[PDB]
From a paper:
The disassembly requires multiple ATP hydrolysis events in the presence of Mg2+; as few as six ATP hydrolysis events are sufficient.
We observed similar states, including a coordinate split of the D1 and D2 rings, for the mammalian homolog NSF after processing substrate. We observed a similar coordinated opening of the D1 and D2 rings for the mammalian homolog NSF after processing substrate. We found that both could process the species-ortholog SNARE complex, albeit at different rates, further corroborating the interchangeability of NSF and Sec18.
Numbering used by the authors:
A (entry chain A): 218 to 424
B (entry chain B): 205 to 338, 345 to 457, 471 to 484, 488 to 740
C (entry chain C): 425 to 484, 499 to 740
D (entry chain F): 105 to 215, 224 to 318
E (entry chain A): 532 to 638
Write the structure that this text describes.
Amino acid sequence: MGIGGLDKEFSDIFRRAFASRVFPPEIVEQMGCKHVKGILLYGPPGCGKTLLARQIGKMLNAREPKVVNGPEILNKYVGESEANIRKLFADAEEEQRRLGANSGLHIIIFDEIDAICKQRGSMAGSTGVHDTVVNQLLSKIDGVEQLNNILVIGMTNRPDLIDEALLRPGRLEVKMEIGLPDEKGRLQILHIHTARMRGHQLLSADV
Amino acid sequence: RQSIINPDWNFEKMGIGGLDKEFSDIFRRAFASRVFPPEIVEQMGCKHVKGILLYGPPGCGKTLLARQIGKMLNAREPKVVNGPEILNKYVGESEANIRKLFADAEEEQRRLGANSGLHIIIFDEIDAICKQRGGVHDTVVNQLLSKIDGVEQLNNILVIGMTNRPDLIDEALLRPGRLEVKMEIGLPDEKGRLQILHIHTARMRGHQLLSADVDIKELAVETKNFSGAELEGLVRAAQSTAMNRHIESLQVTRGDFLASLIKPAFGTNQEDYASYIMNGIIKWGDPVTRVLDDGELLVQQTKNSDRTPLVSVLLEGPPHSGKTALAAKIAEESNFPFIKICSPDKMIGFSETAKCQAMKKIFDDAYKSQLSCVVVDDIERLLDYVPIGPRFSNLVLQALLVLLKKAPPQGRKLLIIGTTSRKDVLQEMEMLNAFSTTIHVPNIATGEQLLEALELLGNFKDKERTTIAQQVKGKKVWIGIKKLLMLIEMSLQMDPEYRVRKFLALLREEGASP
Amino acid sequence: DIKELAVETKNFSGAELEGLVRAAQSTAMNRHIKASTKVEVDMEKAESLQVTRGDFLASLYASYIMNGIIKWGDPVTRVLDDGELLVQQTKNSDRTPLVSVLLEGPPHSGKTALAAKIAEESNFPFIKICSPDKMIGFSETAKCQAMKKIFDDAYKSQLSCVVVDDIERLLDYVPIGPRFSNLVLQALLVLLKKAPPQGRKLLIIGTTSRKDVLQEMEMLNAFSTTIHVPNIATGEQLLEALELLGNFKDKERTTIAQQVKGKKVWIGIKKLLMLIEMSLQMDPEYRVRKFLALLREEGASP
Amino acid sequence: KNIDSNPYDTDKMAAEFIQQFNNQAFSVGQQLVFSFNDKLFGLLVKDIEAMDPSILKGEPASGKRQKIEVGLVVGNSQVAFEKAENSSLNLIGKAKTKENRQSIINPDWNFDKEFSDIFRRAFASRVFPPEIVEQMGCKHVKGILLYGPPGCGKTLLARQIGKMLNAREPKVVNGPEILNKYVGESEANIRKLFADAEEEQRRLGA
Amino acid sequence: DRTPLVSVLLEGPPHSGKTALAAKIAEESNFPFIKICSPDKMIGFSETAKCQAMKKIFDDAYKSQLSCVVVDDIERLLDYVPIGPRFSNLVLQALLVLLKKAPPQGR
Ligand SMILES: Nc1ncnc2c1ncn2[C@@H]1O[C@H](COP(=O)(O)OP(=O)(O)OP(=O)(O)O)[C@@H](O)[C@H]1O
Ligand SMILES: Nc1ncnc2c1ncn2[C@@H]1O[C@H](COP(=O)(O)OP(=O)(O)OP(=O)(O)O)[C@@H](O)[C@H]1O
Ligand SMILES: Nc1ncnc2c1ncn2[C@@H]1O[C@H](COP(=O)(O)OP(=O)(O)OP(=O)(O)O)[C@@H](O)[C@H]1O
Ligand SMILES: Nc1ncnc2c1ncn2[C@@H]1O[C@H](COP(=O)(O)OP(=O)(O)OP(=O)(O)O)[C@@H](O)[C@H]1O
Ligand SMILES: Nc1ncnc2c1ncn2[C@@H]1O[C@H](COP(=O)(O)OP(=O)(O)O)[C@@H](O)[C@H]1O
C-alpha cells in the first residue's frame, strides 16, 4: 500500500479494532457486539501518521474523510468553537436519521488534538479558558442519542496533557505508538520512494 | 384519564444493574404522586416534585439512566439539548433560545389545565451554564431561574440534570421546590458486578456461543474496584480475541478471558512496579528481614482496626541506601486494591499551584475506595530545599501538613508511606509531630555482609573472592548498596589482570567516616 | 402534634417547611404501591390512608468527635463547668454582647474536640465550625474572602457561636525565619472586635497549640479570658482510663500497675489510643510487654 | 419544502414585480404570493413611502417622503424584500435593498531571499524539456508574495521579472477593481481574466 | 546492562579549556545522537522559558536508542553572583531531578 516499516503496528490495529468490520454480519449480530469508536496515534512528526489514516480510510470503502487542523477550529468570538465542532456531525446525523441501520459509516480526522483538549480545572475560580470546548467534544462523541456510523481518529504528541475523560473505555480505548523506523524500514522506504525512477530506468547500478 | 406508564414496562428490561436502592429512592420521591389515584391527591392539595440531580465519577451509568428514565414514561418524545449548543454571539439571542424550550408546555397548560400530559427536558453537562453569580452568563442563569419558577405557576414539568463537578453549581438553583432530589452513583461492589455481567452476557448464553468451562463467579471475584465501563470493555475485547482465531463452532473459553484480562483507571499499575524496582531484592543481612516484618505489622494494623482509620510513618535513610525500593516492595505486598505513587519527576517545571492541584487530585481520587495505599518519595526534593539560606516553598509544606491529619469519609481506610534522606532538616521543620512512628534503614557496616552480597550478586569468581576477603576483613567499612553496584559495574571494564586491585583501590578512595 | 414539630424544626425556611410536608405525603403514599418492579398495581387499602409521625421522623459532629468523651479525671469537670458558666454569661447579658476566650494546653491534648462538645451543649440555634479542611491550596486573598463570608453569615441570627480551629495552621507558621502570613493575622485581629447590629449576640472560641508564639505577636490582648487543658499525669489516672476503655483485663492490669504505680507520666489521650491500637496487633501472650516497652520509650520531657 | 440556500438574482424579481402588478392598489399589512425560478414565495407589505409630489411635478425631490396608509404602484415605483429571520433563501440582486443592519455584537471576553535563489526554488523546473521533468514529476512553485512599505521598487522588480522571461504582455489589476456595484459581477471579472489562459492550455497543451 | 545511567563532572581553574575537551570526547564517542546545550542560545529568556528549553532537549533525547549530552556552563545557567549569594531556585530543582530519571527500558 506504499507504507513500510510498521507492520507490527498495523497487525495490532487490525486485530484489535477492525476484526468485526470484516467478519460476516450474521454471527456478529448474533453476538450483539458494538464497534470500536476511535483510536489515538502519537509520535515524532514526519513519521507517516496521516498517510496511515488515509490508507485505513480507503481500506474499508468509506466516504471521503473530513480532516481539519486542530488550531483553526477555535474562533476568536464567543460561542463559536463549539459550533464548529458540532458542524462536523451533521452529515452523519442526517444520514442515520434517513437510513436507519443501513446508513454508511463516516470519518473524523482530528489533528494536533492536544491543542484543543486539556484537563478541566476542578478548583473554583481556577477554571481553564477553554473548558467549554472540551465539554462540547465530550457531549458530541457519546451522548444521549446514539450514532452507529462514525469513527474518530486523533493524532497528538503530548499524551500526558490530555483530559482523562477522552480515554475512558467509551471513547478512544485503543492506543498505539509510531516510532522512528529502524534499518529495515529505511530500506523499504528507499525502495518505495525510488520505485518510480527504477521503473523509468534512472536508477544507476553504481548506486 | 390515561395512565402514565406503559403496560409493557418492567424493571428487568431496563438493563441497569447495581443501583437497586437508588432506583427505589428515585421512584419513591419522584413518581409516587403521579401514579396514585387522582381523587385522593385532589384531596391532599400538593404540588409535584420538579427536579432530579444525578452525580458521580466517570463510567458509572448516568446517561444510561437518564435515557432509560426518558423512555420509561408514557409522554411524548423528550427534547434533548447536547451540551452548550444554545450559546450565541449576539445580544439577547441565547435568552430567546432558552425561552423557546418551554413554549409548548406553557401553551398546553393554558389550554387544558389539569388534563395535560407530562413534558421532560434534559440538560447534559449543565455545569457549563449555571455557575455561582459574582455579565452574560449571569443573565443566562437569571433567565433560567425566572423561567423555571416565576409569577405564573406551572404544574406539569420535570427536569433531569447530569454533571461531573457538583461543587461548582450556584446555590440558588438547588433548593426545595427546585431540583431537590440528589442522588449519588458510586463505584459498585461485587454483587453489582455480577448483575452487570449478567446483563451484558444474556444473548450469548441463549445461542450456546459460550463455552461451558467459563464460570462467571471467578471473573466476578478477580475484578476488584472495577466500574461498568471496564466490565463492558472486557467482554468486547474477549469477543474480538475469540473471533481473531478464525482468520460456526465458535465459543468463548476461559483462556480468552485470562488473556484479555484493559488497565482500569482506579486499579493497580504493574509498569510502575516494574520501573521502581529494577534489580529485585537481595537478602544480604538481618535488617532487611526486620524491615519487612515491620511492614507486615503495619499492614495488619490498618486492615483490621476500627478506631484508627488513618496511620502515618515516613522512613529515612543514608543517601543511596535504597529507601524507595523497600517502600515499593511494602506497597506491593500490602495486596490492597488501590495503590499509587506520587513522585516529583512528573512535575518538572511545575509551579506551586500545579503541584498542589496534582497532590489534591491524587489524594481526593484515592478517597473513593475502601482500602488505599499511596507512596510519596523524596520529600526534600518535593520541598525544593537548598541549604544555603535556607530557602523553600511554604505553601507546599502547609498543604502536606494539613493533609497528614484529615480523616476520610466514614468507614474508609488509608495508608501513607513517606521516604526521605535528610531527617535532621525534617525535625527542624516540625514535621515529625504528624507521623505515628518511624523505621530506620541502615548501611553496610561489615566485611561479612559485603562478602555475602558479593556472592549473591555473582559477578566475580571464587579466587578473586578469597583475595578480596584477605584485605577487607581487617577492618570495618561504610558503603551503600547502590554505590557498591556502581563500583562493580565500573570495575568490570578493565583488563582481567588488574581488576581486583582496582576494586580495592576504589574502595580505598570512597571510604569515609560514618 | 404540630407544636412538637415546631419545637423540633429550628432554622427552617418557608420552603423547607413546604418540602417537609411534601416529602411526608410522598412517603405516606409510598406504602400502598406494591409491585413497581414487576407491574405497577394499586391495592384496595388506599382508602385507609393516614400520615403518621414515624414518617416525619424518617423525613427529618460525628466527624470531629470520633471517639467520644470519657470522664477520666477531675479536670474534665472543671472545663465543662467553666464552659457552662461562659455560655450562661453570654446568653443573659446586655452590656457586653461580644466575649472571647482561648483554650490552651500542651500539644496532642485533644482541645478541639472539647471545644466542639462545649458548643454542642450550648444548645444555641446557630453553630458553625471553620476548618482548614476546605481551604487546601487557597491563596491568602481567598482565605480572607472565606472568613469574611463566614463571619457575615453570623449577623442574621439572635444568638451565634463560632469556633476557630488550629489557629497556627491558619497563619502558615514555620519556626525557621520565622515566616508567616500577615494578611490573615490582620484580618482576624480586626474581626474580633466588631459588634453585630444592636440586639444580637455572638460568641467566639479559638484553639491553638503554642501559646508563646501568639504571645509574641501581641495577640493575647484581644481575648477576654483563658482556660487550661492538662495532660495525664499519674499512674492511678492511667489505670482509671484503662478501666474505662475496657481493653486489658485485670490479670494484666495488676502487672501493669506494679510498674507504673511507682512513677510519673506525661501523655495525651490520643497518643495513648494509638499505642493501644499498635499493641493489640501482636500475639496474645506478648502484648503487655510491648505496651510497657512502648510506654517507657515514649518519654516525658515535661 | 422548496427551501435552498444559494443566492437568487433578485433585481429581476423586483422589475418583474413592477411589471406584473403595475397600477394596482397596495396597502400596509397586505399578504400576497410571488414566483421566480419556478419557486414560490410568500410576501407581506410592511412600509410604504410615497414619492415626493415634486417628482410627479418633474422637479428634484426634497426627501420629504410621506408615509401613506395606501399607495398606488406606477411605472417607476420601487420595492424592497427583507427576509423574515428564520430563513435560508439567500438573496442579492443589488437593488433588492437591505438596510444596513446596525446591530450590536459582543466579542468573546478573556483573550528575504536572493532573486537567483528564487529562480532556483521556483523556476528551475519550468526551463527543462517536458520529458525529464515528467520523469520524476517535480512539483512547481506558483505563488509569490512581496511585503514591504510603499514604494516604486516593488513595481520596478515586477517589470524586471516581466522582462527577463519570454512571457506574454503582463495583465495588471490595481487594487479591488473586481468589486462592482453589480454584485455578482466581481466574480465575473475573475472568470474573464483566465479565459486566455484556459484557451492556451487547451490549445497548445504542454 | 545493570547501570543504564552514568554521570561525570570536569573541574579545574578558569581558562583551562574544559569546553574543548568535552567537545572532543563527544566527537570521539561515535554515537548517533549528539546535541549541545549552552546558555549562549538563551539570552534574555525568563526562568520558566529556560526550564522549558531544557525540558524540550531532554524529552527529545529520550526518543533515541543511544544518547550523550553535554552541558557547558553550569554557573552561567544558574545566574550565580558572590554577593548574597543570590540565584534562581527553579533551574536548580530541574537539574537535580533530571540527573536521576532513567529512560524507558532498554535505552
Ligand atoms: N450498571 C450498568 N449497567 C449497564 N450498563 C452500564 C452500567 N454501568 C455502565 N454501563 C455502560 O456505560 C455505558 C455508557 O456510560 P455513560 O457515559 O452513560 O455513563 P456516565 O457515568 O454518564 O459517564 P461519564 O461521566 O463518563 O459521561 C453504556 O454502554 C452502558 O452499557
Ligand atoms: N535488598 C535491596 N535493598 C535495597 N535496594 C536494593 C536491594 N536489592 C536491590 N536493590 C537496588 O537498589 C536500588 C534502589 O535505589 P533507589 O534509586 O531506589 O534509591 P533511593 O534510596 O530511593 O534514593 P537515591 O537514589 O536518591 O539514593 C535499585 O537499583 C534496586 O534494584
Ligand atoms: N475526654 C476527652 N476529651 C477529648 N477528646 C477525647 C476524650 N475522650 C476521648 N477523646 C478522643 O480523643 C481524640 C481527640 O483527638 P483530636 O484529633 O481532637 O486531637 P487534637 O487536639 O487535634 O490533637 P493534635 O492536633 O495535637 O494531634 C478524639 O478521637 C476524641 O474523640
Ligand atoms: N590542547 C589544548 N588544550 C586546551 N585548549 C586548547 C588546546 N589546543 C587548543 N586549545 C584552545 O583553547 C581554547 C579553550 O578555550 P575555552 O573557551 O574552551 O575554555 P573554557 O575552559 O571552556 O573557558 P570559558 O569559561 O571561557 O568557556 C580553545 O580556543 C581551544 O581551541
Ligand atoms: N514509511 C513511509 N512510507 C511512505 N511515505 C512516508 C513514510 N514516512 C513518511 N512518508 C512521507 O511523509 C510525508 C508526509 O506524511 P505525513 O503523515 O503528513 O507526515 P506528518 O507525520 O509530518 O504529518 C508524505 O509525503 C510521505 O511520502
